[PDB]
Amino acid sequence: VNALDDGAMEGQNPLTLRSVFSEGFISLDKADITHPDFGIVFSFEDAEATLAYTEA
Amino acid sequence: TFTKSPTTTRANNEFTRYVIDEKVKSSGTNTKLQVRLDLSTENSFLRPRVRRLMVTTRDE
Amino acid sequence: VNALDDGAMEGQNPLTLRSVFSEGFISLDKADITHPDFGIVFSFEDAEATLAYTEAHIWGRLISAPFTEERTIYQGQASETLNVNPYNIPNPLAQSFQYDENRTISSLGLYFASKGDKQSNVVIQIRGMGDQGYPNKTIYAETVMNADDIKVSNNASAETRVYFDDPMMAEGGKEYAIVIITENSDYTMWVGTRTKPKIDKPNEVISGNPYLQGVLFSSSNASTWTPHQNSDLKFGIYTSKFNETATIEFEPIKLILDDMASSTTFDQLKWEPIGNYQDLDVLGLARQVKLRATFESNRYISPLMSSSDLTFTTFLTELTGSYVGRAIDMTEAPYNTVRFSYEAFLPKGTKVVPKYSADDGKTWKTFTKSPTTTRANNEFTRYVIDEKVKSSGTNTKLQVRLDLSTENSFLRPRVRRLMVTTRDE
Amino acid sequence: GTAENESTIFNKSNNSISLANSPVKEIRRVTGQVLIEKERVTRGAQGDGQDFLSNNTAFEIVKVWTETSPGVTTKEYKQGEDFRLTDGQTIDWSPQGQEPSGGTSYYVSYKYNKRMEAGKDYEVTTQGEGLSKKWYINFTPSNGAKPIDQTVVLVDYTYYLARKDSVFINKYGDIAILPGEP
Amino acid sequence: ERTYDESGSYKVNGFELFSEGNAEDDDHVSVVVDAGKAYVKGFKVDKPVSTRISVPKSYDLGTAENESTIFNKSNNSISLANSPVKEIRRVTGQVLIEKERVTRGAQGDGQDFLSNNTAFEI
Amino acid sequence: NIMRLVTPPLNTDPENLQLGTVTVLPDSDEAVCISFAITRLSMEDLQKVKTRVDNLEYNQA
């Protein structure tokens, strides 16, 4: 729970909590935005993620 | 993909809490983790939402 | 201990730590301020909580004062008048300051050029200074000053004195801003501006900056502040140093022989008339007994009580009030043992009764064990209770409470660093 | 004989109310509409959830509001968009509108039918004697809960029944009695 | 004694509960307890095969009285709070009678009885 | 008691080991069965607990 509110992660060789991963949906540090399947959008005010509209 | 069905607890009028607790590996231990959620719709108006994602692992 | 420093909580369905609850007294999020018994006031500069004065006969003169004031900062140069609300006059302001050491601020000095009608009032506030050198929304002190209290003058000579119910503890090396707010568009204040002639001495001009370590600010909503680098207010901050004891004397005074025995039965060190009571009296069945009261002074004496003219009822008021924290849902973590830890400063004639509930405040229980004491500092002392609250079974709800009460107005308790943890044993 | 649902309008001018049948044995139940004012209620952790009133017979919500000091209304919630009455038991916050934060206490005012307790809410007395004797429900105690004004009060109670018998004599000279219907 | 004083009672394995609903009696629900091993009071309890047990059905009744609801002309349906309802003991409600024919008694300044004895307003 | 307020019986007899609880719905064949049996912890399990404590301490640092 405490890790859910951190929303920060170092770029090169980050120190990470052992056996924990939590996403508060407040920062792009935890997210792997460059992954091919990454397609959600963030709503930082609600701390929520969802899908945006796309054509075709 | 997890084989167990999630136990459900209601959070508010909209959101519902889904929790899975499964022994992913019968023998031995994993040493790498990457977490994922696949989101989908079948029309342009009604879309899902997620929040407060927490994953933890244990050696049992 | 880590949760003590969080000071944030969500309104709708908050994620709460299981079997943990702590209150750093830094934000209203953890407190049930709407509770009927909630009557405590926070002091965010010290991270402490205390009781504010509530009024609910003869006069009395505070002879031996409980502290002596000294004017450490004073910007005396003035040149011009600035409206307190420039950006809304038909057809707030602030001034930053800092100290190099830990000082106990007791009162403020301001200068007003003009004021409104009898009914108008001005709100005076001390707010903190954020990392980027601007005032923040946190408020450490607040008071309301009526029109009659605001003195005025055409040569910046009249000094109105502002007193707060709780003293402002200014930490060394930290900036703080005075903030002045009023809804009335007929309030003005003297300001000193560089290169402008002095009001009383037009031959002279303000050569250097008026106050170098401060800046004058202005705002149209008390949120976005426009600095005025070359200008500062004409103001004066007083700091206080408390002394060993303080004494009150009451004007001289149901038949005197019964009365004096009846009175001196009640006026004692342990009833709500706290402190070393004395008197002298006159013979021949004369009516004029004269009372005295002496008590031990400390750093947390209210300046506003010291400055105000006392009465036998405003003094000897027994203040009461309670902290009540938001109900915690321990369904997923049942417990039957509770460890209750809190630091409390208890002057003579004060009490701090811990309490808990396992039914959303329907019923309030009390611990049977006596707390083990560990001295924190010269004032505060750490009280810890570890008790198996339920002999068999497990509770599923938690709500923390602290009950504060005083014998008189001047001496009040203070609590800080409240930590409560539960277990299943 | 059993008398049920014996109805009489309660008047705030006159607390006493009379019972029709004279030889009363015991009053089974006295019920009347009562107004609770300023009932403290704690908000439940679940958002858009249900909070149970102290009395499960409630039928109307008057006012829901919060206070930080006595007599100062911080906010008044509007019924039908912020909350509704559900099952006459709970303040349901399923409507879209605003609601208090989870864990916070708020006040509630509501009307319910209270089952009056003998010697607490009312006291029973009598005036006459014999057949002309009457029984009254006074609602005398000050702290006792009184019915709302110009509302119906229902009283269930039992009473004794008279019997009339016939005397007979047969040819053998045996006097006997046949009991009649009570 | 040693076992209990060291570790107390504890389960080793098994003894899972399963509901089957076997119709041995309409007033009972069958439950199966799976085979398993445990140490109770320091004495081993090894069961090779599951054991069947039956619980009696719950028929105890809770009474709801004076359950109030404002009637509305627009919507005639009114709901009952408790779900598993068995029977409705009584339903009562204010009713207006219009144009009831009454015969004047022989006695002057007397009393004429109404058809219903629960009246409250004329 | 009503399903919202029903609870299992409270017992403190040392001679019995609790295996679980069986809830029966009001007037129905259906029943919910849950196992709450106290189970042992071997030395391997306690060593795993010790390791989890070490990881917790490390995450705290």
Coordinates of N, CA, C and O in Angstrom, one line a residue, chain B residues 12-50:
Chain B
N12 N -17.0 0.6 -4.5 CA -18.0 1.7 -4.5 C -19.1 1.3 -5.5 O -19.2 0.1 -5.9
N13 N -19.9 2.3 -5.9 CA -21.0 2.0 -6.9 C -20.4 1.5 -8.2 O -21.0 0.6 -8.8
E14 N -19.3 2.0 -8.6 CA -18.7 1.6 -9.9 C -17.7 0.5 -9.7 O -17.9 -0.6 -10.2
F15 N -16.6 0.8 -9.0 CA -15.4 -0.1 -8.9 C -15.7 -1.3 -8.1 O -16.5 -1.3 -7.1
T16 N -15.1 -2.5 -8.5 CA -15.1 -3.7 -7.7 C -13.6 -4.2 -7.5 O -12.9 -4.2 -8.5
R17 N -13.3 -4.7 -6.3 CA -12.0 -5.2 -6.1 C -11.8 -6.6 -6.4 O -12.6 -7.5 -5.9
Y18 N -10.9 -7.0 -7.3 CA -10.6 -8.3 -7.7 C -9.2 -8.7 -7.1 O -8.2 -8.0 -7.2
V19 N -9.2 -9.9 -6.4 CA -8.0 -10.4 -5.8 C -7.8 -11.8 -6.2 O -8.7 -12.6 -6.1
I20 N -6.5 -12.2 -6.6 CA -6.2 -13.6 -6.9 C -5.0 -13.9 -6.0 O -4.1 -13.1 -5.8
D21 N -5.0 -15.1 -5.5 CA -4.0 -15.7 -4.7 C -3.7 -17.1 -5.1 O -4.4 -18.0 -4.7
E22 N -2.7 -17.3 -6.0 CA -2.4 -18.6 -6.6 C -1.0 -18.9 -6.5 O -0.1 -18.1 -6.5
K23 N -0.7 -20.2 -6.3 CA 0.7 -20.7 -6.3 C 1.1 -21.0 -7.7 O 0.8 -22.0 -8.3
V24 N 1.7 -20.0 -8.3 CA 1.9 -20.0 -9.8 C 2.8 -21.1 -10.2 O 2.6 -21.8 -11.2
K25 N 3.8 -21.5 -9.4 CA 4.8 -22.5 -9.7 C 4.7 -23.6 -8.6 O 4.9 -23.4 -7.4
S26 N 4.5 -24.9 -9.1 CA 4.3 -26.0 -8.2 C 5.6 -26.3 -7.5 O 5.6 -26.7 -6.3
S27 N 6.8 -26.3 -8.3 CA 8.1 -26.7 -7.7 C 9.1 -25.7 -8.3 O 9.0 -25.3 -9.4
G28 N 10.1 -25.4 -7.5 CA 11.1 -24.4 -7.8 C 10.6 -23.0 -7.5 O 9.4 -22.8 -7.1
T29 N 11.4 -22.0 -7.9 CA 11.1 -20.6 -7.7 C 11.5 -19.8 -8.9 O 12.5 -20.0 -9.5
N30 N 10.6 -18.8 -9.2 CA 10.9 -17.8 -10.2 C 11.9 -16.8 -9.7 O 12.0 -16.6 -8.5
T31 N 12.5 -16.0 -10.6 CA 13.4 -15.0 -10.2 C 13.2 -13.7 -11.0 O 14.0 -12.8 -10.8
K32 N 12.1 -13.6 -11.8 CA 11.9 -12.4 -12.6 C 10.4 -12.1 -12.5 O 9.6 -13.1 -12.6
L33 N 10.0 -10.9 -12.5 CA 8.5 -10.5 -12.5 C 8.3 -9.3 -13.5 O 9.0 -8.4 -13.5
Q34 N 7.2 -9.5 -14.3 CA 6.7 -8.3 -15.0 C 5.2 -8.4 -15.0 O 4.6 -9.5 -15.3
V35 N 4.5 -7.3 -14.7 CA 3.1 -7.3 -14.4 C 2.4 -6.7 -15.6 O 2.9 -5.7 -16.3
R36 N 1.2 -7.2 -16.0 CA 0.4 -6.7 -17.2 C -1.1 -6.8 -16.9 O -1.6 -7.6 -16.2
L37 N -1.8 -5.8 -17.6 CA -3.3 -5.9 -17.7 C -3.7 -5.6 -19.1 O -3.2 -4.7 -19.7
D38 N -4.5 -6.5 -19.7 CA -5.1 -6.3 -21.0 C -6.5 -5.7 -20.8 O -7.4 -6.3 -20.1
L39 N -6.8 -4.5 -21.4 CA -8.1 -3.8 -21.4 C -8.7 -3.9 -22.8 O -8.0 -3.9 -23.8
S40 N -10.0 -4.0 -22.8 CA -10.8 -4.2 -24.1 C -12.2 -3.6 -24.0 O -12.8 -3.5 -22.9
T41 N -12.7 -3.2 -25.1 CA -14.1 -2.9 -25.3 C -14.7 -3.5 -26.5 O -14.0 -4.1 -27.3
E42 N -16.0 -3.4 -26.7 CA -16.7 -3.8 -27.9 C -17.7 -2.7 -28.3 O -18.6 -3.0 -29.1
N43 N -17.6 -1.4 -27.9 CA -18.1 -0.3 -28.5 C -17.4 1.0 -28.0 O -16.7 0.9 -27.0
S44 N -17.6 2.1 -28.7 CA -16.7 3.2 -28.5 C -17.1 4.0 -27.2 O -16.3 4.9 -26.8
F45 N -18.3 3.8 -26.6 CA -18.7 4.6 -25.5 C -18.4 3.9 -24.2 O -17.8 4.6 -23.3
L46 N -18.7 2.7 -24.0 CA -18.5 2.0 -22.8 C -17.1 1.4 -22.7 O -16.7 0.4 -23.4
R47 N -16.3 1.9 -21.8 CA -14.8 1.5 -21.6 C -14.5 1.1 -20.2 O -15.2 1.6 -19.3
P48 N -13.6 0.2 -20.0 CA -13.2 -0.1 -18.6 C -12.3 0.9 -17.9 O -11.7 1.8 -18.6
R49 N -12.1 0.8 -16.6 CA -11.2 1.6 -15.9 C -10.6 0.7 -14.8 O -11.2 -0.2 -14.3
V50 N -9.3 1.0 -14.4 CA -8.6 0.3 -13.4 C -7.9 1.3 -12.5 O -7.5 2.4 -12.9

